Design a protein around this ligand. Structure first.
Ligand SMILES: C[C@H](O)CNCc1ccc2c(c1)OCO2
Lengths: 412, 412
């Protein structure tokens, strides 16, 4: 019968820091991690900026000889996974290695690597393709390499649900523990889609902010002057753990994961419904899953991508789910500061949601200078808001109409 | 407790046929789907053959315009999925659409699209990248497009666990129904990696059979002259359904899904341990899940890729799990005929496991002319074997040491 699940460890690479504490300080101070991109020439692109991971040293984690074989998304995933495990204090042994699994996902995976090998193929021939092209690019290799390095023999898999990946990864890993398939799961996601095909591809679809001359003000969720999402890189990993297993070993518990919802919009390949019907279904699923009155919700970490249709759909979903309580809770998009980490988005945002519970503060939506028509909720414009948070909700919505909601609460 | 899960619809594209009955007819006849790859310059490549889908007409399923938006792997997953839903007789209504979800996966995803858009990028610049590049290439768009075309609002996700994808997709879909999160799921996998990058990428790891003189003899699982796997394309989809839901509408039930096992080798990035310790834990996990003794297993559809180390590890794993019953069961590799459909391998081989139960026949391992050292099990060499089959296992063991096992049982 269904077991309870707590968070005992967290790790992160974001545009704001090379770990959780440093990233979280940036969040609470309203700092942007968005800057013109330096790792390639974007003069022929309509978008020339994003949230890069700055000064990442893979040799804090791996040998240069292994690192070279792996796409950045995998390096980022392992760094965050390693951080989360260290932060948990958990020791892998013969007694428990079979009860510890990993579900680290990505939206796009090794696009940089696949592009580079495509270039080698087209310009030089097939004999210049890396022998590591497949194990070093495909999405399940975060879960793979983590299990090899730590000796994790539990359930080993990866989700790819586009911008919903990190939320789904975390939610399903909690279901694994809930149902007895595992006692511990390392779950989240990683993304590094800032190559030509990534920036070009979102560019072709006219989905990205083109504010090349003011990159820190580009991501402006619910602002009337928003013009698309900002593309960001990084990783989030959490250690999820059966409550009694955590209690038995005296683990520090950050929070309890009480709720998980999924739904499909069945509306459009890329556009959300204007009324947020799919998001409303998903949140209601998650709150029912948690046994909650919707009035218990204090804080929502919105998807909040800074697209015209996405942002407004979310307001509608929250108003429809929470009614008059929609006016009492605080909702913010940390994408105002981090940008959109795509498949890692749900992962870093689940960490920020937990930290909102630990520190009792709503992170700000920076750049919200003129809230758009109907965007009249407490969106924590400009500045972090200290406040009572017992229950925090993290939303994600992706291409394919795929929706995810996580529900966290304080644990005593 | 836990709801029972049955199979009420199946769909398929394979190198043997454009649907299930044509593919199954090839399987039982021991026909090969392997041939030199056409309309593609493989001159500089060490492998020139594989299992292509022959004569696929996407306009039976989609308009020309919607198909132009989608990678072949997505077209193949939609084909299989529409066939499976149609095969099931299911009527989607307002009253049930929130209880019907999708989990269709891929191991490698949109390489053909990535290649063609790379061509554009390098030759002409980013502004020639297709607007539909991203949503038309990402792995969750089979689940996404299927849910939109049919109005499915239940759990909407996609696994990517390399060569284990289709096994995990079906297993986790069965969990969703068992634990009351859905009444119906469409689950499986699709793959189209018979492009330059797939053939070049795997060719660079020297993972592929190079037997160009005799493509139909290349895939020879457990044969002492095997020299690696054969790369193949296609899709499988099953309609999974809660038993009482299936009985109430009078569904035709092919078989019951009674068990799902997962495990990680925690061994190596591409190589299994020699003793198959991980495949052994996974099969034991699947049998415990089913509440079955190893002695009750009649038929195993092996992973059986035709890699030197893979085939021998699976022999060790079965001998370890099944002790004195290991010779009594029949075990065959349908990859001897289909090749390795990678992420779709577990989907089509689940379908072949279900039809082995319906038709009481173990499919052959063709090309098994000279079993290797220790390959002395009943591997159904050369020809189909009619026999009693109450319980059938389908195994998938993929890169990152990720293992999957499904247990099916006759329903009457
Ligand atoms: C780090 C580097 O970008 C990887 N190789 C790409 C690359 C390969 C071959 C080429 C080329 C470019 O221009 C002409 O022939």
């Amino acid at each position: 019968s269904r077991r309870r699940v707590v968070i005992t460890g967290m790790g992160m690479l974001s545009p704001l820091g090379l770990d959780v504490p440093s990233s979280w300080e940036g969040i609470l101070a309203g700092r942007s991690g968005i800057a013109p991109i330096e790792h390639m020439d974007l003069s022929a692109y309509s978008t020339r900026f994003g949230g890069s991971v700055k000064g990442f040293n893979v040799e804090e984690y791996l040998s240069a000889k292994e690192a070279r074989k792996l796409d950045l998304f995998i390096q980022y995933g392992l760094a965050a996974s390693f951080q989360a495990v260290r932060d948990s204090g958990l020791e892998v042994t013969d007694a428990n290695r079979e009860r510890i699994g990993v579900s680290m996902g990505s939206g796009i995976g090794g696009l940089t690597n696949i592009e580079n090998n495509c270039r080698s193929l087209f310009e030089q021939g097939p004999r210049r393709i890396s022998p590591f092209f497949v194990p070093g690019s495909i999405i399940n290799m975060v879960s793979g390499f983590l299990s090899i390095h730590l000796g994790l023999q539990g359930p080993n898999y990866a989700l790819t649900t586009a911008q919903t990946t990190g939320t789904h990864s975390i939610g399903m890993a909690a279901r694994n523990i809930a149902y007895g398939e595992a006692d511990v799961m390392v779950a989240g996601g990683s993304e590094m889609a800032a190559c030509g095909l990534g920036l070009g591809g979102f560019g072709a679809a006219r989905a990205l902010s083109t504010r090349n001359d003011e990159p820190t003000r580009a991501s402006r969720p619910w602002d009337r002057d928003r013009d698309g999402f900002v593309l960001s890189d990084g990783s989030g990993a959490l250690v999820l753990e059966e409550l009694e297993h955590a209690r038995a070993r005296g683990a520090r518990i950050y929070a309890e994961l009480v709720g998980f919802g999924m739904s499909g919009d069945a509306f459009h390949m890329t556009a959300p419904p204007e009324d947020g019907a799919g998001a409303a279904r998903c949140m209601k699923n998650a709150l029912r899953d948690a046994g909650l009155d919707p009035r218990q919700v204090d804080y929502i970490n919105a998807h909040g991508t800074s697209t015209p249709a996405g942002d407004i759909a979310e307001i509608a979903a929250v108003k429809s789910v929470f009614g008059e309580h929609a006016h009492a809770l605080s909702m913010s998009s940390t994408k105002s500061m981090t940008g959109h980490l795509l498949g890692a988005a749900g992962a870093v945002e689940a960490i920020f949601s937990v930290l909102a519970l630990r520190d009792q503060v709503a992170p700000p939506t920076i750049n919200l200078d003129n809230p758009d028509e109907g965007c009249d909720l407490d969106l924590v414009a400009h500045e972090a808001k200290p406040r009572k948070i017992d229950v925090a909700l993290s939303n994600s919505f992706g291409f394919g109409g795929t929706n995810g909601t996580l529900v966290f609460r304080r644990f005593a």
